RNA sequence: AAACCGGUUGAUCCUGCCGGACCCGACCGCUAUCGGGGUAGGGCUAAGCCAUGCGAGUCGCGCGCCCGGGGGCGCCCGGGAGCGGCGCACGGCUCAGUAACACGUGCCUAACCUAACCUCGGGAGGGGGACACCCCCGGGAAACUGGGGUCAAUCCCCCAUAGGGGAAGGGCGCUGGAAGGCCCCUUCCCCGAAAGGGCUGGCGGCCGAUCCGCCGCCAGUCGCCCGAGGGUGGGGGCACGGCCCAUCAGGUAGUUGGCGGGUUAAAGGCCCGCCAAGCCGAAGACGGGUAGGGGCGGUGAGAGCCGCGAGCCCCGAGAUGGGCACUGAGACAAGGGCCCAGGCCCUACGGGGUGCAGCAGGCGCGAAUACUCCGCAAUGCGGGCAACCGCGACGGGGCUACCCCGAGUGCCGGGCGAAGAGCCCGGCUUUUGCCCGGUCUAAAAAGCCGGGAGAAUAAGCGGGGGGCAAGUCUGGUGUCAGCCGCCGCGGUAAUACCAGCUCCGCGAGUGGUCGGGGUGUUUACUGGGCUUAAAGCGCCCGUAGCCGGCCCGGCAAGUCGCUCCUGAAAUCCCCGGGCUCAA
């Protein structure tokens, strides 16, 4: 599979004319192709540690880069929203957080925060033994007993412990919580969920966030609750 | 299978009755079909597992002797023997040539039964007593 | 199906009827005054002037609210280039600009006007042969449009 | 287009003008059609010989039709045996 | 710059056509010094025929064997022919077919499949087999290929369990707008997993230098199987949008629909059995013609017109014509298979191979065209734990008046010349051209820095009667020769032809012919006309369509305002920045 540079996603931090005709294609991993950046692109164009694809692939193949608590030795590994990126020989820890200008940026985060990931619940399924499988925004799954799975609804958020494989906390989608827009145009805006128009399709409901007097609107699919008035994890 | 001899692709005829040109010269393998594989009434059950699209498998009953006949008036399942086919309402040629299809009436040892399964697609004859 | 290719930038300055005696006389006067190589240079200068004037016309046609975030930076950029002398003049005065203001910003013209050359053609020869330094570097293009801040940093070898 | 010259012909100019404009008959290679092509320039006909390959080209005039006083001629010779008749007439080249 | 000019008259106002002037694209002529930027170049011509070379490999950390060097513990290093895994369905070309769910925009699949990768939960037990390379023999012209022997596997198969599918009944529960779905319970039938394999280190045991292994445990690590979701690719469906012709008016009969089935991964007249007469059409069926669609491009002040809608990106189709299959997650597969047709090449006559619409290259056609070059260094991809390997993709140069950008072909003073050209004299400079070094380059070339001699190495094309800038100067010819986009010259005194001199326009370009736009208010929505210039049907009835009185109440479809999801990128406009400015 190839990725022509013209068909590369528009938000990617690469030049559109100066360069080759190809771009590094993400390797079908734990995100969306159009909402993720390959690890080699992160190493070469986002952190500037490697000057070529060869040097970036060397750095990745040594195992110096860790994504969400797991060493990633594939240079095409997708990196997406809220992922924790950890550099081993340097000790620097970033979170892939929504950004107003670059649309997705690596912001440094504390080491205590590096083991948590805020994952937006994307759906629920019934699996064998009567258990509930929660599907999150990046394709991750969690199988839980039916009673705990009953009270978690779609579009909720869970702060999830990567190291324990557990749900550290659950943040339900209620009016007045703090939410961040993770998608289109109004990206990166943090504000209070204060207004909803419930369309017939729940994913397409109109949501309005407020930051003092700053009112932005999106659809319900494009927001993620990151807690009450103070965000649980450092996003900015 | 996926055979060009049993192509399931579009027609060349418009709804207005006129013809239209061929957008694609060759026949897609994805749009190919296969010949009928419904069982023939025989002396022993012969089953054949076939590879299909995407590497999945389909069990074909190339010859059928026994039927899983369900009596709802007893709430019981019995593995009966097919003496003959009484009728094939979809096409009488099936019963005439002793082929078993869905909706076919079969005279098994428990009585008359309607075939409630697709024997060419499921590989078994699930039947319901009448 | 169309592939974009670059077009001539002096077309907006080039006239459509070249065989007018009055137009030929004024163009010949300008060419001889500023020592231009050919008519293409004069038409390029006129194209620059036409861009400036049509930008002024467009900003005039926009409403006051739209014009507000663009009017001051536009005049500031013209002043910094050296085409306009007062950056706070009204916008409609920009409509009356002249190509001689643009022709004055040529490096050969500035080398002649600073008295560094015996003539305008000698200034062109200086810039071509590379004896003109702009803030330390050799600028060898006689048609370079020097800005106001770089005007005083012109030297001879 | 290309053609092979068959005969040399002379057309009479239109009524107010008095002259014999000298042309050739050319058979086009691609179609085989035979058409009269004007040979321009003073003494231009003397550089043309029978069975000579020529380049036939539109004579100009309004809407691609005949020119000023030549009646019913739509073409003219531009090349003779691969060499331009203008260059041959001016002496810059010699006819091969 | 929102522009007019010449021509029908004895003269005048109109109409109206044709020409001039501009830009762009193709081909062509004369001429041509350098540099930069750029996704220019057999498209506009035969999807015409092809010699030759190259154009998809990688993995010893899946597997046995053989060879060579080294060393004692249990092997180390290198190489070979292979089996085996993964890839080759991406990438590259071209424009015949196609007026179509092809393409674009907006939505679906609750009617579907998906190797590789991600996550969550669970599993990996017993047993068996064969075929390469190889050895001994070959056969055949070659292609290719036979027999025996023999070592393996992450190779092939069986068994068990997990799991899966079909039919039927029931349910709190899940998702979701909505269950024909998921989960749970119940019954029968049916299908039916896996490689604990590799490596590392540690432990223990068996074994032997005729060995350099095998076995049991642990940890790490790369792996294998099942269930669910995602990801990616793909199949399928829907609404709407974009050509010409009536000198094409009726078309359709599996045609339109229903019911029951088969097939499919999956819905569907997709196909089949029965049943009905339905379906399309003047709001243009059907028929013919043309054409790949889009982003986009040229032109104009704009509305608009055109497709140069060739090159660059996305989708489609094809691989000499027409068909059909194997393998595989995926093909009915451009450098894989089979058949007919139609060619061609080799042959030892028995056989074999082959179609450049891959990168170079040859023939042919045509008005019309590039090197049988260099590298995997950049951009990526396949393989690999990795290191690395490969790649006519891609990158680099070559050739070529491909498009845009920046420059040179000298400057200064004096004289002769005319104020011109040119020549000479005195001085200055070295862009440029030439030679050298560093830097640069995968290496080169070029570029940049620096050094040497030197005015020294460098201007053409078109034109001068009006349009339209430039000669009633000179010679020749004498309605001939020739000019002439139009108007018009030439028949002895030619400003128009042939030459000289001289001047004009643009200039590394300048001209010829074509096609588009402007021109053109000569297609008229903006915005034309129909008494007589072209143009009211001889008159009337009326279908579709278009256009339609007043007031009040409801809606909110058009309409208007704001907002959101979108309309790929490049392209276009504005702004800031970086290449010496510029492009
Ligand atoms: Mg005429
Ligand atoms: Mg008259
Ligand atoms: Mg061709
Ligand atoms: Mg391995
Ligand atoms: Mg080997
Ligand atoms: Mg392809
Ligand atoms: Mg296996
Ligand atoms: Mg199930
Ligand atoms: Mg089994
Ligand atoms: Mg085994
Ligand atoms: Mg069906
Ligand atoms: Mg049909
Ligand atoms: Mg106009
Ligand atoms: Mg090409
Ligand atoms: Mg064929
Ligand atoms: Mg083939
Ligand atoms: Mg061919
Ligand atoms: Mg070729
Ligand atoms: Mg490389
Ligand atoms: Mg130039
Ligand atoms: Mg004098
Ligand atoms: Mg060099
Ligand atoms: Mg001349
Ligand atoms: Mg003359
Ligand atoms: Mg004049
Ligand atoms: Mg003339
Ligand atoms: Mg009119
Ligand atoms: Mg009349
Ligand atoms: Mg009348
Ligand atoms: Mg009539
Ligand atoms: Mg009449
Ligand atoms: Mg409305």
Curated annotation (Swiss-Prot), chain A:
Task: Offer a single GO CC term for the protein.
Answer: cytosolic small ribosomal subunit
Please verify whether the record's keywords include Cell membrane. no
One GO biological process this protein is involved in is:
translation
Q: Which UniProt keywords apply?
A: Ribonucleoprotein, Ribosomal protein, RNA-binding, rRNA-binding
A GO molecular function for this record?
A: structural constituent of ribosome
> Which residues does the UniProt record annotate as the domain S4 RNA-binding?
37-109
- What's the family? Belongs to the eukaryotic ribosomal protein eS4 family.
Annotated NCBIfam families? PRK04313.1
Listed name of the protein? Small ribosomal subunit protein eS4
Native species? Pyrobaculum calidifontis (strain DSM 21063 / JCM 11548 / VA1)
What gene name is listed for this protein?
Answer: rps4e
From Swiss-Prot, chain B:
Q: Which domain of life is it from?
A: Archaea
Q: Where is this region: Disordered?
A: 15-36
Q: One GO BP annotation here?
A: translation
A GO cellular component entry from the record: ribosome
CDD domains on file = Ribosomal_S8e (cd11382)
Q: Where is the composition biased (Basic residues)?
A: 17-30
| Example GO molecular function | structural constituent of ribosome
Task: Could you list this entry's UniProt keywords, alphabetically sorted.
Answer: Ribonucleoprotein, Ribosomal protein
A single Pfam family it belongs to is Ribosomal_S8e
Q: Cross-referenced HAMAP family, in alphabetical order?
A: Ribosomal_eS8
The record, for NCBIfam families, names: eS8
Q: How does it assemble?
A: Part of the 30S ribosomal subunit.
Q: Which family does it belong to?
A: Belongs to the eukaryotic ribosomal protein eS8 family.
This chain belongs to which protein, by name? Answer: Small ribosomal subunit protein eS8
Swiss-Prot record, chain C:
InterPro entries, per the entry:
Ribosomal_uS4 (IPR022801), Ribosomal_uS4_arc (IPR022802), Ribosomal_uS4_CS (IPR018079), Ribosomal_uS4_euk/arc (IPR005710), Ribosomal_uS4_N (IPR001912), S4_RNA-bd (IPR002942), S4_RNA-bd_sf (IPR036986)
NCBIfam families associated with the record: PRK04051.1, uS4_arch
Q: Which Pfam families match?
A: S4
Q: Which PROSITE patterns match?
A: RIBOSOMAL_S4, S4
Could you name the domain of life of the organism this protein comes from?
Archaea
* Function text: One of the primary rRNA binding proteins, it binds directly to 16S rRNA where it nucleates assembly of the body of the 30S subunit.
Give the protein's recorded name. Answer: Small ribosomal subunit protein uS4
Does the record bear Ribosomal protein in its keywords? yes
Q: Which GO terms describe its biological process?
A: ribosomal small subunit biogenesis; translation
**What's an example GO cellular component term for this entry?**
small ribosomal subunit
Subunit details: Part of the 30S ribosomal subunit. Contacts protein S5. The interaction surface between S4 and S5 is involved in control of translational fidelity.
Protein family membership: Belongs to the universal ribosomal protein uS4 family.
| Any one Gene Ontology molecular-function term assigned to this protein's record | rRNA binding
Using the record's annotation, list all stretches that form the S4 RNA-binding domain.
105-157
In its UniProt entry, the species of origin is given as: Pyrobaculum calidifontis (strain DSM 21063 / JCM 11548 / VA1)
Q: Which UniProt keywords apply?
A: Ribonucleoprotein, Ribosomal protein, RNA-binding, rRNA-binding
Swiss-Prot record, chain D:
Annotated Gene Ontology cellular components are: small ribosomal subunit
Keyword line: Ribonucleoprotein, Ribosomal protein, RNA-binding, rRNA-binding
GO BP terms? translation
Output the Gene Ontology terms for molecular function: rRNA binding; structural constituent of ribosome
Q: Relate the assembly described in the record.
A: Part of the 30S ribosomal subunit.
Function field: With S4 and S5 plays an important role in translational accuracy. Located at the interface of the 30S and 50S subunits.
Assigned protein family: Belongs to the universal ribosomal protein uS12 family.
The name of this protein is: Small ribosomal subunit protein uS12
* Gene field: rps12
Shown part of the complete sequence: 50 to 145 of 147
């Amino acid at each position: 599979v190839h990725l022509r540079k013209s068909l590369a996603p528009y938000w990617w931090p690469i030049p559109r004319k100066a360069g080759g005709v190809w771009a590094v294609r993400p390797s079908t991993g734990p995100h969306s192709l159009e909402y993720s950046l390959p690890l080699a692109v992160v190493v070469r164009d986002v952190l500037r540690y490697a000057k070529t694809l060869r040097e970036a692939r060397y750095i990745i193949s040594r195992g110096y880069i860790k994504v969400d608590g797991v060493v990633r030795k594939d240079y095409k590994f997708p990196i997406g929203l809220m992922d924790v990126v950890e550099i081993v020989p340097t000790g620097e820890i970033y979170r892939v957080v929504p950004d107003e200008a670059k649309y997705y940026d690596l912001k440094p985060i504390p080491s205590s925060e590096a083991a948590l990931k805020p994952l937006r619940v994307e759906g629920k399924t019934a699996v064998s033994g009567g258990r509930i499988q929660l599907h999150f925004h990046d394709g991750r799954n969690l199988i839980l007993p039916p009673d705990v799975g009953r009270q978690i609804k779609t579009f909720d958020t869970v702060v999830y412990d990567l190291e324990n494989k557990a749900i550290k906390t659950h943040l339900p989608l209620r009016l007045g919580q703090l939410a961040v827009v993770t998608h289109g145009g109004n990206i990166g805006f943090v504000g209070q969920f204060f207004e909803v128009v419930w369309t017939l399709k729940r994913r397409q409901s109109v949501v309005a966030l407020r930051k003092g007097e700053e009112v932005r609107r999106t659809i319900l699919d494009y927001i993620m609750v990151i807690g009450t008035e103070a965000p649980v994890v450092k996003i900015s | 299978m996926k055979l060009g001899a049993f192509y399931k692709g579009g027609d060349l005829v418009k709804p207005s009755g006129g013809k239209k040109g061929r957008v694609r010269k060759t026949k897609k393998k994805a749009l190919g079909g296969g010949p009928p594989q419904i069982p023939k009434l025989g002396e022993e059950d012969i089953r054949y597992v076939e590879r299909v699209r995407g590497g999945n498998h389909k069990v074909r009953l190339r010859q059928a002797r026994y039927a899983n006949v369900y009596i709802p008036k007893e709430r019981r399942h019995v593995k009966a023997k097919i003496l003959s086919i009484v009728s094939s309402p979809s096409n009488p040629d099936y019963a005439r040539r002793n082929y078993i299809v869905k909706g076919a009436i079969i005279q098994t040892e428990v009585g008359k039964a309607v075939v409630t399964s697709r024997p060419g697609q499921d590989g078994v004859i699930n039947a319901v007593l009448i | 199906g169309g592939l974009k290719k670059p077009k001539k930038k002096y077309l907006a300055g080039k006239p459509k009827k070249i065989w007018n005696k009055q137009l030929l006389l004024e163009e010949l006067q300008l060419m001889g005054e500023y020592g231009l190589r050919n008519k293409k240079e004069l038409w390029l200068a006129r194209a620059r002037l036409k861009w400036i004037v049509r930008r002024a016309r467009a900003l005039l046609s926009m409403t006051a609210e739209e014009r507000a975030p663009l009017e001051v930076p536009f005049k500031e950029k013209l002043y910094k280039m050296g085409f306009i002398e007062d950056p706070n003049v009204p916008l409609d005065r920009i409509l009356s600009l002249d190509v001689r203001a643009i022709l004055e910003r040529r490096l050969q013209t500035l080398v002649f006007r600073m008295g560094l050359a015996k003539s305008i053609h000698h200034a062109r020869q200086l810039v071509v042969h590379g004896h003109v330094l702009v803030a330390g570097r050799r600028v060898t293009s006689p048609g370079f449009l020097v800005p106001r801040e770089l005007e005083d940093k012109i030297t001879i070898e | 287009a290309r053609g092979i010259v068959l005969e040399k012909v002379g057309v009479e100019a239109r009524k107010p003008n008095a002259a014999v404009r000298k042309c050739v008959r050319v058979q086009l290679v691609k179609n085989g059609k035979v058409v009269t092509a004007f040979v321009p320039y003073d003494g231009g006909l003397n550089y043309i010989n029978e069975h000579d390959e020529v380049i036939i080209e539109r004579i100009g005039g309004p809407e691609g039709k005949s020119l000023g006083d030549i009646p019913g001629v739509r073409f003219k010779v531009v090349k003779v045996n691969g060499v331009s008749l203008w260059a041959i007439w001016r002496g810059k080249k010699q006819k091969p």
